[PDB]
Amino acid sequence: HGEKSQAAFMRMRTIHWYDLSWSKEKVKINETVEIKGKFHVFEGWPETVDEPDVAFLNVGMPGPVFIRKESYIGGQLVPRSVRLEIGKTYDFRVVLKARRPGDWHVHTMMNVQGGGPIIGPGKWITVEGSMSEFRNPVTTLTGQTVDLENYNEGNTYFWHAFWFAIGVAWIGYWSRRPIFIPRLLMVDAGRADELVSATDRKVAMGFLAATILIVVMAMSSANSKYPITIPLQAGTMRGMKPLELPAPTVSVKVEDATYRVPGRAMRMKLTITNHGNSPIRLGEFYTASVRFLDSDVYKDTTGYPEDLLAEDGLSVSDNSPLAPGETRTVDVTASDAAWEVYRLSDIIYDPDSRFAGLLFFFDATGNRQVVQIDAPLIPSFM
Amino acid sequence: HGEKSQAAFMRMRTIHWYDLSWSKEKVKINETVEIKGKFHVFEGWPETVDEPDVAFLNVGMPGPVFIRKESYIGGQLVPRSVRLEIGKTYDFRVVLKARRPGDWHVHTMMNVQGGGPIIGPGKWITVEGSMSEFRNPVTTLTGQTVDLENYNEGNTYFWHAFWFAIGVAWIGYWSRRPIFIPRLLMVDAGRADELVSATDRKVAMGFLAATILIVVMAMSSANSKYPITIPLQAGTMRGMKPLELPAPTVSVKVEDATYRVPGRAMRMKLTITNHGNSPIRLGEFYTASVRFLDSDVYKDTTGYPEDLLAEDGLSVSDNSPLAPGETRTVDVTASDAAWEVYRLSDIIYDPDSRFAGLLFFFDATGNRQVVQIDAPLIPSFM
Amino acid sequence: HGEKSQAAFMRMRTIHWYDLSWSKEKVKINETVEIKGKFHVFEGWPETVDEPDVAFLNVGMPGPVFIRKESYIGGQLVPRSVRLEIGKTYDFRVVLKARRPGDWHVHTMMNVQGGGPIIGPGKWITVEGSMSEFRNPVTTLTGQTVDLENYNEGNTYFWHAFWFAIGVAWIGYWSRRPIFIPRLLMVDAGRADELVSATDRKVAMGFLAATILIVVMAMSSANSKYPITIPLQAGTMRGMKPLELPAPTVSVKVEDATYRVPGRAMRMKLTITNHGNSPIRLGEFYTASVRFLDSDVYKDTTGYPEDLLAEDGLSVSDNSPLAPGETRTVDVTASDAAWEVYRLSDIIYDPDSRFAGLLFFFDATGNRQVVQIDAPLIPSFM
Numbered sequence A, B, C: 001h002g003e004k005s006q007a008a009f010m011r012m013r014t015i016h017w018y019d020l021s022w023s024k025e026k027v028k029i030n031e032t033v034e035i036k037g038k039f040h041v042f043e044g045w046p047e048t049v050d051e052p053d054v055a056f057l058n059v060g061m062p063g064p065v066f067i068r069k070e071s072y073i074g075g076q077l078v079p080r081s082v083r084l085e086i087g088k089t090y091d092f093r094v095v096l097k098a099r100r101p102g103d104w105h106v107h108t109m110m111n112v113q114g115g116g117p118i119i120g121p122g123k124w125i126t127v128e129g130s131m132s133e134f135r136n137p138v139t140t141l142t143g144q145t146v147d148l149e150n151y152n153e154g155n156t157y158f159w160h161a162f163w164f165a166i167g168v169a170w171i172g173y174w175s176r177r178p179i180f181i182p183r184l185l186m187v188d189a190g191r192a193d194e195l196v197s198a199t200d201r202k203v204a205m206g207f208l209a210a211t212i213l214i215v216v217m218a219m220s221s222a223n224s225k226y227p228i229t230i231p232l233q234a235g236t237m238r239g240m241k242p243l244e245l246p247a248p249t250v251s252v253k254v255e256d257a258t259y260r261v262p263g264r265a266m267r268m269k270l271t272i273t274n275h276g277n278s279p280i281r282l283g284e285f286y287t288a289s290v291r292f293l294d295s296d297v298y299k300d301t302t303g304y305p306e307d308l309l310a311e312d313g314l315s316v317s318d319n320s321p322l323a324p325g326e327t328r329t330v331d332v333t334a335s336d337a338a339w340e341v342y343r344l345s346d347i348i349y350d351p352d353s354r355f356a357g358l359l360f361f362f363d364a365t366g367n368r369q370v371v372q373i374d375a376p377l378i379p380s381f382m
């Protein structure tokens, strides 16, 4: 939730999430779900979004209904912010543990500093069980195993209640006497010195000394109880390993790209050159989490969110085997209610009417090439 | 105009504009002139100029004597700011349309954010005709063809005059009575409440209600008249395609570079190694829009501004065919009044006495290699 | 001095200084000492240190006990700040001239803007002689040879004394009369106009006119005496040539890296793959200026500061010739008091417990390969 309201061109021109898998659709409490996939950083990064020099891989959900057990970018655990390069592709994996029952829309997201949220496709996952069964065991380097759900709760309650009680006692010591009107009149009359006695001064001295001594003793006792402590671990982790992918033996030029403004579709003229890899055929156009597929060339079998999957939303004028070398100019039409449901038609309000997306080409043997396209998008009103 | 006053080293060390062409020297009104060429970004970019992450290709002229019909960087239209990389070469093309008659010095420039203006060579172009004949037709996506010279002029005049008249009427309603002295005396005397009557309150209420209602009705009518509107299109366009140029089979090392301070020339010792490409010969040294040529090796036939063209300003101790492999140390002398006219001799006031420029080598067949040189420049006073 | 107090991980993860040489250990006054070596910029640059876009090569010493005659980065003199790229290796050379007698700990350092100091290994150098024998001759472009120790000293003294005397005379002219109490009483009584006479006004006018005229005449005389002047030369020098080094035919993966917190050592599990270059053997681990060596494989003969040299501080479970192709998992133990002396054990207070260093592999013929390792460092308390 939160993507439909984001500018259409910003969603089109930031990060592209390609083949994704979810290990389970329905999980029990304390069971783990794995979300893997690839994300590509668009070369034409918008200028109002800072470059992903400081980026964090996040899980979009209405709260800690899951707990993120681990997250890996390129096989490396990433508990901190990371640095990503423009134009590179990265594998990502996220292992989550179920905490609260219910149906949850879970998304993979990249939070970018100086940019904001970049939400990926969301999937509905059902958690069955009771929240009381959730456990979060962690073993420390000191040899102690604790449960993070209730660890250190009683100590915090005790100390906060103790200090609150001390403050309440300090206020109530003075609250046993007339408070506001008689004291104000006495101060106005010049009898302020009569409002504080020697016993009050001794009580204040005792309160101050007891507070300081208790703080010192509590710090000493806490140090004795936990002689081994480390500061909070923070920093930006550089040197993320990107994917070394086969360059596309397929070249695609966008002649024109238009959308009818009333409109639930997008149309584009494309010149495609096959540089080998056998006769190929376009099977899918990915724009903003929406996948328009050509049923005759490719069929999704990964449980891609159906609200974002158009099984026959790709209409190519001529989708015949493009013999290696053939340069065919084709008119592709990406049509689906998701265009209007995911407010991609709101590119009419955007201060930049340019789109970007991914095209997937398959040969007879099923090998897939990914081609990256970007162009300006012209609205049609006649 | 405006380059002679810019620091000599800043002009030497930012952008180099090489082979340029102008389609016409004399044009009529509404006729188009094309300026094409190449620009190279110097690797040793000055630190006080921000990197050209946000750069705009501009035309330097005393105003809209021309209108910039289009501009292309690497074959791509660039109506917005673009991103350029240090050390890369780009083709540029600019098509301008003549608007005002007269002789105009036209320059191609790169405005760089956090840096300032980078002016290129200027050429004198004559426009013959009358300004009243200039037309700027534009066809909108709604099917309307308009002339940008006078489009929406009457509407703006009408609305501004209407609101100015309303304000004048509001002031003049109160201006029919004594204004300053009697009213001031009455306010001082305590008779302020007598200065505003019930009729005045009713007039003020009517003015407020009429203003609000007129604004609302005008907005509704404007929306009805123009139901299709888009916001201003802005942004920085990345992914500019640079030139893939042959690396210079010629290696040049600058041993020493000196200039006499009184002085109208510059001298340099150079070690040149030919790595193939047949016997070569130096034909031209480009510094800051100034081209020093060796008449025996090369002759300009592009109409390069004569104030910046020194046909025999390159004197090479030995400019004989440098057999592939020969490593000759030569003393080159670049001499021309342009050195003093374009204030390149003002490098003596610069906080950085280092120069950069381009050397052009030609073989027997006429093939040209471009070598890029940079060195510190030492003034000579004895 | 000043490195032991710097965070251990910051010292481990910034710049690595490898093979270094000092021309002399004991020098006389006016004699020169050359310090050469290589420095590598770590790929995982810490986020709190700005990238070395503006870096200066500096000499760490308690003052001008030496004078830095020259400094070269990649064979190019670097009197100004320079730009360095992450992940590149550079040669550096520094020629210093002895000025003051005594024993001096001299370090090579890289000052990085927005980062702070990066100190390298320090060496003790003895200077014998008298400071009065030190000379700093410099020949100017005007044909004058001067000594920078005493040049322009007398002129500065004369002008400062002259202006101080003028100010003292101005104060003392008024100081001959009663100063504070009688004048205050007269001003309070309304007799302020009697405290300044016409002669005082004439004296003030003469002082003002003389000051302005003297300033103008002094400027004119200084211009006449030195008709050739240049501004201060400043700027950041880009285009530093890095080393083109053989990629390591040796691959090393860090399985685990741990240190006992009481502790004077560090332990690591490593998987090493030989990709040719004959049977190899680990001979040295460099962490933070500390070099742990395996005496049986390699011996230092460069006079590396002994406080930072552990001749037998590298213990490899199996350090037998790793036949090209062999993938052996070995347990290496780097032990030395320098770990505690140079406060590398203070990584326990660091907000980032990750280390980086260099491994040196030698074959039978003595050829050396450098492998770069980085991992998180886990403290052991049991």
Ligand SMILES: CCCCCCC/C=C/CCCCCCCC(=O)OC[C@H](COP(=O)(O)OCCN)OC(=O)CCCCCCCCCCCCCCC
Pocket (backbone or CB within 6 Å): A168, A171, A172, A175, A176, A177
């Ligand atoms: C829950 C209260 C709201 C917020 C409290 C915030 C800070 C505390 C303020 C007052 C503390 C001192 C009590 C008054 C002097 C406590 C005090 O003097 O009690 C005797 C009073 C005074 O004697 P008197 O002049 O002969 O009688 C006048 C009132 N009948 O008599 C009483 O019968 C008791 C009345 C006082 C009861 C108020 C207690 C509420 C405060 C404790 C709340 C603790 C929880 C805090 C978080 C919400």
Ligand SMILES: CCCCCCC/C=C/CCCCCCCC(=O)OC[C@H](COP(=O)(O)OCCN)OC(=O)CCCCCCCCCCCCCCC
Pocket (backbone or CB within 6 Å): A204, A205, A208, A209, A212, A213, A216
């Ligand atoms: C690092 C330097 C210290 C900071 C400088 C200021 C220090 C001030 C000193 C007092 C100067 C004022 C004159 C008072 C003369 C001595 C003095 O302390 O008198 C009591 C004064 C009231 O002043 P007075 O009676 O008119 O003074 C005349 C002689 N008694 O109250 C206080 O000082 C505050 C309340 C009583 C203090 C008891 C200790 C509790 C507070 C400290 C914590 C102790 C427990 C430590 C935990 C381990």
Ligand SMILES: CCCCCCC/C=C/CCCCCCCC(=O)OC[C@H](COP(=O)(O)OCCN)OC(=O)CCCCCCCCCCCCCCC
Pocket (backbone or CB within 6 Å): B168, B171, B172, B175, B176, B177
């Ligand atoms: C061009 C004027 C300069 C700038 C104007 C700026 C804002 C407007 C100020 C005054 C408007 C109300 C007029 C006075 C009450 C208009 C008004 O009350 O006119 C009757 C006056 C007053 O009657 P009275 O007391 O019996 O006579 C005294 C003056 N003789 O009599 C007149 O004979 C007319 C004199 C007033 C003429 C001034 C008009 C100029 C202002 C309009 C300019 C519009 C263009 C604006 C942009 C420049």
Ligand SMILES: CCCCCCC/C=C/CCCCCCCC(=O)OC[C@H](COP(=O)(O)OCCN)OC(=O)CCCCCCCCCCCCCCC
Pocket (backbone or CB within 6 Å): B204, B205, B208, B209, B212, B213, B216
């Ligand atoms: C979103 C919330 C609204 C903002 C809150 C403030 C609103 C204020 C309300 C009035 C409170 C003061 C008491 C007045 C009582 C009602 C009232 O409006 O009285 C007239 C008052 C003068 O006060 P009064 O006579 O002593 O009031 C006693 C009873 N009449 O003048 C005004 O309110 C201003 C001039 C007359 C207003 C006429 C409408 C023109 C202005 C609004 C635009 C209407 C056209 C819309 C275009 C589509």
Ligand SMILES: CCCCCCC/C=C/CCCCCCCC(=O)OC[C@H](COP(=O)(O)OCCN)OC(=O)CCCCCCCCCCCCCCC
Pocket (backbone or CB within 6 Å): C168, C171, C172, C175, C176, C177
């Ligand atoms: C070294 C002094 C410290 C700093 C000086 C800073 C600025 C100068 C202040 C005073 C200058 C005017 C002198 C007084 C009027 C100089 C002056 O009027 O001298 C005659 C006085 C006054 O005559 P009187 O009323 O009959 O006698 C009263 C004092 N006996 O008599 C004297 O016997 C001389 C006393 C004055 C000597 C003070 C001189 C010190 C200042 C010069 C220092 C220069 C070095 C500067 C850097 C440190």
Ligand SMILES: CCCCCCC/C=C/CCCCCCCC(=O)OC[C@H](COP(=O)(O)OCCN)OC(=O)CCCCCCCCCCCCCCC
Pocket (backbone or CB within 6 Å): C204, C205, C208, C209, C212, C213, C216
């Ligand atoms: C660029 C524009 C200049 C700045 C504008 C202000 C200039 C001010 C002028 C004076 C106006 C006040 C009326 C005084 C009338 C003329 C005048 O200068 O009178 C003397 C006034 C005192 O005023 P007054 O006697 O009541 O004036 C009545 C007629 N004399 O003192 C001063 O002006 C200051 C002290 C005397 C000046 C002598 C010259 C020394 C200062 C300047 C440097 C000269 C040497 C140059 C070196 C090459």
Ligand SMILES: CCCCCCC/C=C\CCCCCCCC(=O)OC[C@H](COP(=O)(O)OCCN)OC(=O)CCCCCCCCCCCCCCC
Pocket (backbone or CB within 6 Å): A162, A165, A166, A169, A198, A199, A200, A202, A203, A206, A207, A210
């Ligand atoms: C959450 C836990 C709540 C803690 C509650 C603590 C109690 C707080 C205040 C008690 C007020 C009694 C005032 C009696 C003066 C009532 C009073 O003033 O009585 C006259 C005495 C006469 O004493 P004397 O013998 O003639 O002279 C002194 C030596 N003999 O004067 C005084 O000066 C008596 C001073 C006594 C002050 C006691 C207050 C100390 C409170 C510290 C509390 C510590 C916090 C808890 C620790 C875990």
Ligand SMILES: CCCCCCC/C=C\CCCCCCCC(=O)OC[C@H](COP(=O)(O)OCCN)OC(=O)CCCCCCCCCCCCCCC
Pocket (backbone or CB within 6 Å): B162, B165, B166, B169, B198, B199, B200, B202, B203, B206, B207, B210
């Ligand atoms: C650029 C175009 C210029 C537009 C010029 C607009 C004219 C402006 C002001 C007229 C002043 C007349 C004042 C008469 C009070 C003169 C006045 O006060 O007369 C006494 C009346 C008595 O009226 P009554 O009948 O006894 O009671 C009300 C119901 N019957 O009192 C009032 O309260 C009369 C109020 C009348 C106010 C009229 C002003 C409205 C002006 C709106 C202009 C709209 C803008 C143009 C639209 C395109």
Ligand SMILES: CCCCCCC/C=C\CCCCCCCC(=O)OC[C@H](COP(=O)(O)OCCN)OC(=O)CCCCCCCCCCCCCCC
Pocket (backbone or CB within 6 Å): C162, C165, C166, C169, C198, C199, C200, C202, C203, C206, C207, C210
């Ligand atoms: C470090 C070097 C130190 C320099 C010391 C300079 C001496 C400073 C002040 C002298 C005070 C004498 C005051 C006499 C008034 C004492 C005074 O006021 O005497 C009455 C005269 C009467 O003169 P008169 O003839 O009747 O009228 C004028 C034409 N004839 O009035 C005046 O107005 C006299 C004005 C004389 C002022 C002289 C002060 C000039 C000082 C400039 C110094 C230059 C700096 C050094 C250059 C290298």
Ligand SMILES: [Cu+2]
Pocket (backbone or CB within 6 Å): A001, A002, A105, A106, A107, A122
């Ligand atoms: Cu959602």
Ligand SMILES: [Cu+2]
Pocket (backbone or CB within 6 Å): A015, A016, A040, A041, A042, A043, A372
């Ligand atoms: Cu992409």
Ligand SMILES: [Cu+2]
Pocket (backbone or CB within 6 Å): B001, B002, B105, B106, B107, B122
């Ligand atoms: Cu010009």
Ligand SMILES: [Cu+2]
Pocket (backbone or CB within 6 Å): B015, B016, B040, B041, B042, B043, B372
């Ligand atoms: Cu260049």
Ligand SMILES: [Cu+2]
Pocket (backbone or CB within 6 Å): C001, C002, C105, C106, C107, C122
């Ligand atoms: Cu030291």
Ligand SMILES: [Cu+2]
Pocket (backbone or CB within 6 Å): C015, C016, C040, C041, C042, C043, C372
């Ligand atoms: Cu390194």
